[PDB]
């Protein structure tokens, strides 16, 4: 079911593309339109080959040249598009990690929404790129049950999806009820073990049974029982278990709701998911907010940045 | 013939074990008894899996938590037990290497008693763990013929055991006689080449022939001809060629002989050899010192430390 | 057709060799003659095995000992001979790279004359040895079109030799004519793309056609149109396309022409090419300068340095 919005261009000629891009920047000024039309129409792997052909022909670094010619949010988007897909989540995490100035929204968004297979790949790329252990750095800049839940998720050890055992569903739903609503205070450890390690298909059934038993959705309990960064993370984990595309659609919605735009979040989501499930994200977005992702981006963004974003997204008639 | 005292626990459940350990430390105080009974009854590989399950369930680092809860020599022993077997000798060497403050006893003990196959593995683990070349660091903190002999041994290039050539045995025994007892001064280079590079089975025959020719055991010549760190190393090499378990039994004996205990040596030997030849060490110990290793540990050690050591050793009725 | 002047010694005994070398340095003074006669008569791989046997027997580092005993240009040559072949070009490049004090002659000589297969191997060895990216370091210490051409060559992406297309030969020869002689100023980008990326066999035909069209050899155009480091690099690239051995023969010729000797260049060329094409270099040298490489070295060099160089070169009767 999972589909992105960007695929390999048929009849790709990396050398031709590199020439077009050189022409766009060569000499006075910059043809931003030529740049954005080309790069939004090539897959990430294809952008890498363009970069290598550009360096072969001209002995210039393509990204460095674009960083020189381009400006503002447009530049930020183009540089994000050029990052190899295998490194992008790691790069975003690395840039989130910076002392008490750490960007917890980013840690939560990525770590909650990436699959165990994705996280294994992220941990490897991060260590190779930056010479540090991701878990160590996360532990360094976080504290409390928030850190613990992140470490649990970073183990990428979630139970595999297997046949559902109804008695285990009952036991876990009851455990959660006893650990939160029936407890003075909260047994956070219990929530973390169950939400962090049980399989996705098992937890979906647990969530339904928990509603049946308690009269609350698990998200309602979480808001009633916790707060702060732990609350945001537990909500992101639950929402991701229910539907990753739905959680990411919501993330996009809130980046553009209110005054201005959370541009960093907008760029990160669109670029990171453009070859995975951005199509599914569009669908969830239109189902849940009765408005196209396209029309919300169109209304929230300006100039070449807007143009490039809309080309990546598609879905005018969503 | 080689047997350790610790083996894989049958019916191992890493998750269950992790829960037991969490219960032991959770909240006020610490159940040291639960900790030592469990960990001494699991193999090193099994301890690693427990650590991974603990982190998966609770998002806590098991060793860090134990370092927080435990104290003293007991803590030192538990942390030593948790070090992956493939890294432990490298860790001990790294910790021995520290300027003119270097711990030569440790360099000698490990490098003399480990097989060429073990040393190849140690050199690799050390470089991977610490980003340094073991040989370079040894050379950095040692001097003289002591350093040279260590470098020779670090090459892990000892002749393989093959059919014994009686004439070569005669030649080497005579060479040794001429290089030491018949020489004004000592040709250390000759001792180092022969002791450092000839095969174990060849040198065992050389030692017997040397006694026949000279009327001295090679160990007696070494004490007569050399002194200081070179003497200790040459003795350790000879004793290891004769019997590694016997050399390690002697090492343990002297750690506990006299006032107090060399606890660092006691922990290192017991832990490092617990899955290789600690059973053989016990046997040599009882043969050579007419007393059980168990009874000597029992008499020399206190509290939870004593309990854990005795469980690892076994051999009450040795 | 490609032949070196040094090959594997038949009946090689690394242990025997190590003993000879130890004897040469042991005690007061040094037997330089024994050292140079042996090492010039062993291949690079064989020198590595000698070094390992020396360390195994004596626990001494062979190169460190030679650095201690030897002096001057002789020492520099012996140390160069001991560097593993797979690391030598990388070592020379690393030593060329040092701020505005950078040795451009070395960057040009190596990068222009090494094949794409050789450069791939060099880039890998450099990163492994020094923890840095070669391209990054080159970019750091160079500027302008000189840097660009070096980066192009460092991509090691030259078109493969395939069937020649006469129309493409015409197009490229005309392109070059239009980019230089017919242009006010020079389109350096065009020269760099064509000279840097087209196949060797294609460019050889382009050079002939360019002469036919313009009445100039490409080297004459280069001198007419460019200057400085870019000129030297473009000439080295063209000369290498025509004949690597011929370019290296010329490089040697100029190292010894005039007062004194460029010893660093002499050592680098002889050692780096001794197992590849130094025989071909000798032949080109004798064809083009009507004098033996041997006789020029003999006349330009002194002492043990001279002796060792002449043994490596051969070709008294060239
Ligand atoms: Ca421009
Ligand atoms: Ca413009
Ligand atoms: Ca910019
Ligand atoms: Ca509660
Ligand atoms: Ca709340
Ligand atoms: Ca807005
Ligand atoms: Ca506690
Ligand atoms: Ca207690
Ligand atoms: Ca402690
Ligand atoms: Ca003597
Ligand atoms: Ca003595
Ligand atoms: Ca004692
Ligand atoms: Ca000497
Ligand atoms: Ca001399
Ligand atoms: Ca010297
Ligand atoms: Ca011109
Ligand atoms: Ca010129
Ligand atoms: Ca000269
Ligand atoms: Xe919670
Ligand atoms: Xe000795
Ligand atoms: Xe040129």
Q: Which helix (H) or strand (E) holds C158?
A: none
Contact C67, C74 (CB under 8 A): no
In three-state secondary structure terms, A315 is coil
Contact B196, B152 (CB under 8 A): yes
* Helical residues (DSSP H) of C99-217, grouped into ranges: 104-113, 116-130, 134-141, 144-154, 166-179, 188-197, 200-214
In three-state secondary structure terms, C100 is strand
Contact B20, B38 (CB under 8 A): yes
- CB of C60 within 8 Å of any CB in chain B? yes
A56 contacts C155? CB cut-off 8 A? yes
Residue B108: both structure tokens together: 């000698």
Query: Would you put residue B99 in left (φ > 0), alpha (ψ -120 to 50) or beta?
Result: left
- Domain B11-83 in CATH 1.10.620.20? The answer is no
CA distance A250 to A247: 5
User: HSE-up of A295 (CA within 13 Å, CB side)?
Assistant: 9
C59 contacts B150? CB cut-off 8 A? yes
- CB of C198 within 8 Å of any CB in chain A? no
Residue B162: both structure tokens together: 């093959």
Bridge partners, residue C72, by sequence: none
C213 burial level (CB within 10 Å; 0-12, 13-18, 19+): middle
A157 contacts B59? CB cut-off 8 A? no
A-B C-beta contacts closer than 8 Å: 28
B197 contacts C57? CB cut-off 8 A? yes
DSSP per-residue letters across A174-188: HHHHHHTTTSSS--H
C134-141 and C116-130 are packed helices; what angle lies between their axes, rounded to 10 degrees? 90
Contact B288, B246 (CB under 8 A): yes
Question: In Å, how far is A267's CA from the nearest CA of chain C?
Answer: 28
Residue A236: both structure tokens together: 């992101």
Closest residue of A to C192, CA-based?
A58
Contact A186, A225 (CB under 8 A): yes
DSSP per-residue letters across A80-108: HHHS-HHHHHHHHHHHH-BTBT--HHHHH
Determine phi and psi for B38, rounding to 5 degrees. -80, -55
Least CB–CB distance from B58: residue in A150, A157, A189:
A189
Instruction: List CB contacts (< 8 A) between A157 and chain B.
Output: 52, 56
Residue A188: both structure tokens together: 């956070």
Cα B218–chain centre separation: 23
B85-96 and B104-113 are packed helices; what angle lies between their axes, rounded to 10 degrees? 140
Closest CA to C22 of C48, C52, C47, C57: C57
Give the Å distances, CA to CA, from A197 to A109, A179, A190, A297, C260. Answer: 18, 16, 11, 36, 75
- CB of A197 within 8 Å of any CB in chain B? yes
- CB of A56 within 8 Å of any CB in chain C? yes
Contacts of C239 (CB under 8 A, 6+ apart): C112, C219, C246, C247, C250
- CB of B56 within 8 Å of any CB in chain A? yes
DSSP per-residue letters across B183-230: SSS--HHHHHHHHHHS-HHHHHHHHHHHHHHHSS-HHHHHHHH--HHH
A52 contacts C152? CB cut-off 8 A? no
Contact C93, C85 (CB under 8 A): no
DSSP code for B30? -
- CB of B52 within 8 Å of any CB in chain C? no
Query: Would you put residue C21 in left (φ > 0), alpha (ψ -120 to 50) or beta?
Result: alpha
Least CB–CB distance from C56: residue in B147, B189, B197:
B197
Question: In Å, how far is A149's CA from the nearest CA of chain B?
Answer: 6
Closest CA to B57 of C235, A155, C193, A5: A155
Determine phi and psi for A194, rounding to 5 degrees. -70, -50
Bridge partners, residue C98, by sequence: C100
DSSP code for C187? -
A271 burial level (CB within 10 Å; 0-12, 13-18, 19+): buried
- CB of C52 within 8 Å of any CB in chain B? yes
CB count in 10 Å sphere of residue B55: 21
CA distance C231 to C219: 9
DSSP code for B70? -
Q: After which residues is chain C broken (C to N over 2.5 A)?
A: none
B147 contacts C56? CB cut-off 8 A? no
The angle at the Cα of B122, spanning B243 to B172, to the nearest 5 degrees, equals 40
Q: Which helix (H) or strand (E) holds A147?
A: helix A144-154
* Helical residues (DSSP H) of chain C, grouped into ranges: 14-25, 32-39, 44-58, 62-69, 72-82, 85-96, 104-113, 116-130, 134-141, 144-154, 166-179, 188-197, 200-214, 218-225, 228-242, 244-256, 263-273, 278-289, 293-300, 303-313
Contact B224, B181 (CB under 8 A): yes
Cβ of B226 less than 6 Å from ligand 20: yes
Contacts of A183 (CB under 8 A, 6+ apart): none
Cα A190–chain centre separation: 27
CA distance A150 to A133: 14
Question: In Å, how far is C157's CA from the nearest CA of chain A?
Answer: 7
User: HSE-up of B52 (CA within 13 Å, CB side)?
Assistant: 13
Closest CA to C164 of C198, C126, C192, C115: C198
C293-300 and C278-289 are packed helices; what angle lies between their axes, rounded to 10 degrees? 90
CA dihedral of residues A46, A52, A57, A60 (deg, nearest 10): 120
DSSP code for B157? -
CA distance B292 to B313: 10
Bridge partners, residue A98, by sequence: A100
Cα B93–chain centre separation: 11
- CB of A57 within 8 Å of any CB in chain C? yes
Cα B102–chain centre separation: 17
Cα A208–chain centre separation: 26
Residues across chain A: 318
Bridge partners, residue C100, by sequence: C98
User: A290 C-alpha to center of ligand 18: Å?
Assistant: 85
Contact B127, B134 (CB under 8 A): yes
CA distance C66 to C51: 11
In three-state secondary structure terms, C71 is coil
Bridge partners, residue C66, by sequence: none
B200 burial level (CB within 10 Å; 0-12, 13-18, 19+): middle
Determine phi and psi for B100, rounding to 5 degrees. -55, -10
Residue B259: both structure tokens together: 């006032």
First CA to last CA distance, chain B: 17
| CATH no. for C158-243 | 1.10.220.10
Which chains are adjacent to chain C, needing at least 3 Cβ pairs under 8 Å?
Answer: A, B
Helix and strand tally (H, E) in chain A?
20, 0
Three-state secondary structure readout of B265-316? HHHHHHHHHCCCCHHHHHHHHHHHHCCCHHHHHHHHCCHHHHHHHHHHHCCC
What technique was this entry resolved by?
X-ray
A57 contacts C151? CB cut-off 8 A? no
Residue B64: both structure tokens together: 């860090």
DSSP per-residue letters across C108-130: HHHHHHS-HHHHHHHHHHHHHHH
Helix and strand tally (H, E) in chain B?
20, 0
First CA to last CA distance, chain C: 17
Cα A220–chain centre separation: 24
B148 contacts C59? CB cut-off 8 A? yes
B189 contacts C56? CB cut-off 8 A? no
Determine phi and psi for B96, rounding to 5 degrees. -80, -25
CA dihedral of residues C116, C118, C119, C121 (deg, nearest 10): 130
Contact C71, C32 (CB under 8 A): no
B-C C-beta contacts closer than 8 Å: 28
Contact A298, A291 (CB under 8 A): no
Q: CATH for C84-157, among 2.60.40.10, 1.10.220.10, 3.40.50.300, 3.30.2130.30?
A: 1.10.220.10
B134-141 and B144-154 are packed helices; what angle lies between their axes, rounded to 10 degrees? 170
Contacts of B88 (CB under 8 A, 6+ apart): B80, B271, B272
DSSP per-residue letters across A235-271: HHHHHHHH-HHHHHHHHHHHHHSSSS--HHHHHHHHH
Least CB–CB distance from B157: residue in C56, C58, C60:
C56
CA distance B301 to B178: 47
Closest residue of B to A158, CA-based?
B56
CA distance C291 to C300: 13
Instruction: List CB contacts (< 8 A) between B197 and chain C.
Output: 56-57
Residue B216: both structure tokens together: 């001295």
* Ligand nearest, relative to CA of residue B75: 9
DSSP code for B260? S
Report every protein residue that has its C-beta within 5 angstroms of ion ligand 9: B 71, 75
- CB of A192 within 8 Å of any CB in chain B? yes
Cβ of B180 less than 6 Å from ligand 20: yes
Enter the resolution in angstroms: 1.8
Bridge partners, residue A100, by sequence: A98
CA distance A125 to B24: 36
C251 burial level (CB within 10 Å; 0-12, 13-18, 19+): buried
CA distance C268 to C275: 13
| CATH no. for A244-315 | 1.10.220.10
The angle at the Cα of A262, spanning A257 to A267, to the nearest 5 degrees, equals 115
Contact B310, B294 (CB under 8 A): yes
Residues across chain B: 318
CA distance B129 to A106: 30
CA dihedral of residues A238, A242, A243, A249 (deg, nearest 10): -50
User: A303 C-alpha to center of ligand 2: Å?
Assistant: 11
Question: In Å, how far is A158's CA from the nearest CA of chain B?
Answer: 8
User: HSE-up of C156 (CA within 13 Å, CB side)?
Assistant: 15
Domain boundaries in chain B?
11-83, 84-157, 158-243, 244-315
Closest residue of B to C26, CA-based?
B189
Query: Would you put residue B156 in left (φ > 0), alpha (ψ -120 to 50) or beta?
Result: left
Nearest CA to ligand 20 atom 1: B222
Largest CA distance in chain B: 71
CA distance C43 to C275: 8
Write b or e for each residue in C6-40: b if 16 or more Cβ atoms lie within 10 A of its Cβ, otherwise e: beeeeeeebeebbbbbbebbeeeebebeebbebbb
In three-state secondary structure terms, C199 is coil
Contact C236, C112 (CB under 8 A): yes
Closest CA to A48 of A5, A17, A75: A17
CA distance C78 to C35: 9
CA distance C48 to C12: 12
CA distance A237 to A230: 11
User: A75 C-alpha to center of ligand 3: Å?
Assistant: 6
Contact C146, C230 (CB under 8 A): yes
CA distance A276 to B229: 64
Topology match between the domains A84-157 and A158-243:
yes
C193 contacts A55? CB cut-off 8 A? no
The angle at the Cα of C30, spanning C25 to C34, to the nearest 5 degrees, equals 80
Residue B11: both structure tokens together: 């019916």
Instruction: List CB contacts (< 8 A) between C55 and chain B.
Output: 151-152, 155
Choose from B27, B52, B54, B59 for mutation: most chain A CBs within 10 A.
B59
Contact C35, C75 (CB under 8 A): no
Q: Which long-range contacts (CB under 8 A, 24 or more apart) does C130-134 make?
A: C130/C90, C130/C94, C134/C90, C134/C93
B149 contacts C57? CB cut-off 8 A? no
* Ligand nearest, relative to CA of residue C68: 15
Question: In Å, how far is A302's CA from the nearest CA of chain B?
Answer: 43
C59 contacts B149? CB cut-off 8 A? yes
Nearest CA to ligand 21 atom 1: C222
Nearest CA to ligand 19 atom 1: A222
CA dihedral of residues A292, A296, A297, A300 (deg, nearest 10): 170
Question: In Å, how far is A236's CA from the nearest CA of chain B?
Answer: 17
Residue B7: both structure tokens together: 């083996």
User: C166 C-alpha to center of ligand 6: Å?
Assistant: 60
Q: Please report the sign of the dihedral spanned by the C-alpha atoms of residue C172, residue C176, residue C182, residue C187.
A: positive
Choose from A50, A56, A58 for mutation: most chain C CBs within 10 A.
A56
CB count in 10 Å sphere of residue C254: 11
CA distance B91 to C165: 63
CA distance C82 to C44: 7
- CB of B55 within 8 Å of any CB in chain A? yes
DSSP per-residue letters across A175-233: HHHHHTTTSSS--HHHHHHHHHHS-HHHHHHHHHHHHHHHSS-HHHHHHHH--HHHHHH
Provide the chain C residues 149-178 that lie in CB contact (below 8 A) with chain A. 149-152, 155, 157
Tell the residue number behind the tokens 């009445």, with chain if given.
Answer: C215
CA distance A209 to A213: 6
Closest CA to C50 of C21, C71, C78: C21
Contact B314, B294 (CB under 8 A): yes
CA distance A103 to A97: 7
CB count in 10 Å sphere of residue C149: 26
In three-state secondary structure terms, C182 is coil
Residue A234: both structure tokens together: 């537990």
- CB of A131 within 8 Å of any CB in chain C? no
Contact C81, C275 (CB under 8 A): no
* Ligand nearest, relative to CA of residue B232: 11
């Amino acid at each position: 079911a999972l589909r992105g919005t960007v695929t390999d261009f048929s009849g790709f000629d990396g050398r031709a593309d590199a020439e077009v891009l050189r022409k766009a920047m060569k000499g006075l000024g910059t043809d931003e339109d030529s740049i954005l039309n080309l790069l939004t129409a090539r897959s990430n792997a294809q952008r890498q080959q363009i970069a290598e052909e550009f360096k072969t022909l001209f002995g210039r670094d393509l990204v460095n040249d674009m960083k020189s010619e381009l400006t503002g949010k447009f530049e930020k988007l183009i540089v994000a598009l050029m990052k190899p897909s295998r490194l992008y989540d790691a790069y975003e995490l690395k840039h989130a990690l910076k002392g008490a100035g750490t960007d917890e929204k980013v840690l939560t968004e990525i770590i909650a929404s990436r699959t165990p297979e994705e996280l294994r790949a992220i941990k490897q790329a991060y260590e190779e790129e930056y010479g540090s252990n991701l878990e160590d750095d996360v532990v360094g800049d976080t504290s409390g049950y928030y850190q613990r839940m992140l470490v649990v998720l970073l183990q990428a050890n979630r139970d595999p999806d297997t046949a559902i055992d109804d008695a285990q569903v009952e036991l876990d739903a009851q455990a959660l009820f006893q650990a939160g609503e029936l407890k003075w205070g909260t047994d956070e450890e219990k929530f973390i073990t169950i939400l962090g390690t049980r399989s996705v298909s098992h937890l979906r059934r647990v969530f339904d049974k928990y509603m049946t038993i308690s009269g609350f959705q698990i998200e309602e309990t979480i808001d009633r029982e916790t707060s702060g960064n732990l609350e945001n993370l537990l909500l992101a984990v639950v929402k991701s278990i229910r539907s990753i595309p739905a959680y990411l659609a919501e993330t996009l919605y809130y980046a553009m709701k209110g005054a201005g735009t959370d541009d960093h979040t907008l760029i990160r989501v669109i670029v990171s998911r453009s070859e995975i499930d951005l199509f599914n994200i569009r669908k969830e977005f239109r189902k849940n907010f009765a408005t196209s992702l396209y029309s919300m981006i169109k209304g929230d963004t300006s100039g070449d940045y807007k143009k490039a974003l809309l080309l990546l997204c598609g879905g005018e008639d969503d």
